[PDB]
Amino acid sequence: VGEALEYVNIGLSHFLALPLAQRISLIIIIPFIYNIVWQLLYSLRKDRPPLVFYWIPWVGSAVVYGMKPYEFFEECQKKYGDIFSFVLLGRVMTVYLGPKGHEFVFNAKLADVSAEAAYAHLTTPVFGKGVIFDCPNSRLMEQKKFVKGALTKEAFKSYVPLIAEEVYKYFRDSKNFRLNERTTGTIDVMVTQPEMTIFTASRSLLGKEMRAKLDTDFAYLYSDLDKGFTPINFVFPNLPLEHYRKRDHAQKAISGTYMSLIKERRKNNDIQDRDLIDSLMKNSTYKDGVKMTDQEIANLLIGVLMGGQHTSAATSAWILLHLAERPDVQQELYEEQMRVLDGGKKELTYDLLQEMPLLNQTIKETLRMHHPLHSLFRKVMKDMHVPNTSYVIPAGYHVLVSPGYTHLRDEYFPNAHQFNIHRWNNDSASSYSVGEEVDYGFGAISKGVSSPYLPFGGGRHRCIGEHFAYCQLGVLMSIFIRTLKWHYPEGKTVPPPDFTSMVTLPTGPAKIIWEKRNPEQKIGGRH
């Protein structure tokens, strides 16, 4: 033994004096071997869900998960069942598939999991400090209440003509259309829909001043701010690169613009009930009496606009793309437009939108097939026992829930990969509570989150934008349908989703050909 302890020390010294051909070599093989040995040992544990095997330490299953998450989930599900873990760029993600996974993650106790700890590192640099995920959950809850206060039926009634005006202006003025000059053309929907989305959301939520800014070089700041909203920021949120500083600059410049308007509205006592800015100026005091600062108000405006931007733009792109190979659905939607709007003699209102079930069912079905967020995350803050299992998810893990995956399962939606708006006949609401409700601070929502359809998530982190999204999408698609027919270039069809971007937008270029339904129809107004 004595001799052995000596030769241990000796072996150590001979180890340190290896040629750096082998030292560099051992710098690679040692962690590689430890990783594989650690996994085999991990597999022996019965209080842990199975862990997907991976070859490269730290990286884990990043590539296959990033490129095709639903295919990844399906294969893991076949081998391991509904609960399994995988390593992702240094983190361990525990996936719980299906309605029980929805319950496990969306209805997890506040003490058990943290959304802000999963999300803040990306969003905070983009939006700014003090809001959304850069604050305690209790603060988020009331910010959602504040924002929801501008998103009432009365507001939607006033937004609908504004959104309509923006859509028509876009048809009139955008080079992508120019309907007074051209009767047919080709567009990339991932060019048109982001523009139509920011134009309509700006006009209605932010108001005319902020909409007008988008016709200036100021619009480039939004483009710059947009480039900070990228999944890689979950890993590298701050690097001394240029686009990171353009991001920081844009946030300052845009929030500064919002603050300028806010302070100006207050100076002139010009605070009314037009938009989300008026609403937050009038209603942004927390229940402990602390008021949101003008900066936090501006930051919250940025987050709300950015949130609504990507989910909605991707969704209307998908709607156009699915309908492009379905002239039968376009035809059916057009008949409904003619029926509800008296052949076009009626002006579209929010109330008439609610009487367009097939149009709303079209949005609903598109959100089924294209959940914009394929994976929602929480960081596990306290050890969690998985009910009816021996599994414990330890603090420091992340949990991953994927309702968009269940959207595409035949067991819950027959012929799930078929686009069929009629699967929602007599069920055209954006969603609803099938039972008991609870209020986390921003209104009563469904207590259960077991619905296999969950485009807007559930529990305390549930979306509050769904009715604004349907309003915006509804107005936009109503006008599209009444104005245009469209189809694919020969041999083109619905593109696959890009699962590596922030939302599951279509892989580009995603082009459709439009044609005026009334070649001679003119859009009035000056330009």
Ligand SMILES: CC[C@@H](C)n1ncn(-c2ccc(N3CCN(c4ccc(OC[C@H]5CO[C@](Cn6cncn6)(c6ccc(Cl)cc6Cl)O5)cc4)CC3)cc2)c1=O
């Ligand atoms: C590196 C190699 C490469 C192959 N790779 N390897 C892995 N990946 C990858 C993995 C995962 C993902 N992502 C996609 C994005 N995703 C995600 C994005 C946003 C998100 O948002 C949830 C929260 C925060 O943002 C919002 C989004 N939102 C909700 N409604 C509207 N937007 C949010 C909520 C509230 C407010 Cl005010 C703003 C915002 Cl933005 O909710 C959650 C997940 C995580 C997985 C992407 C790429 C790769 O690309």
Ligand code: HEM
């Ligand atoms: C089709 C459109 C949209 C879809 C499918 C969608 C989806 C979602 C989902 C799944 C969540 C929960 C995320 C999680 O649990 O981690 C969420 C949260 C949220 N979304 Fe949306 N969203 C949409 C549009 C919007 C719009 C238009 C707005 C604002 C007007 C908005 C603002 C918010 C807010 C404030 C939250 C709460 C975040 C939290 O509490 O952590 N969303 N959304």
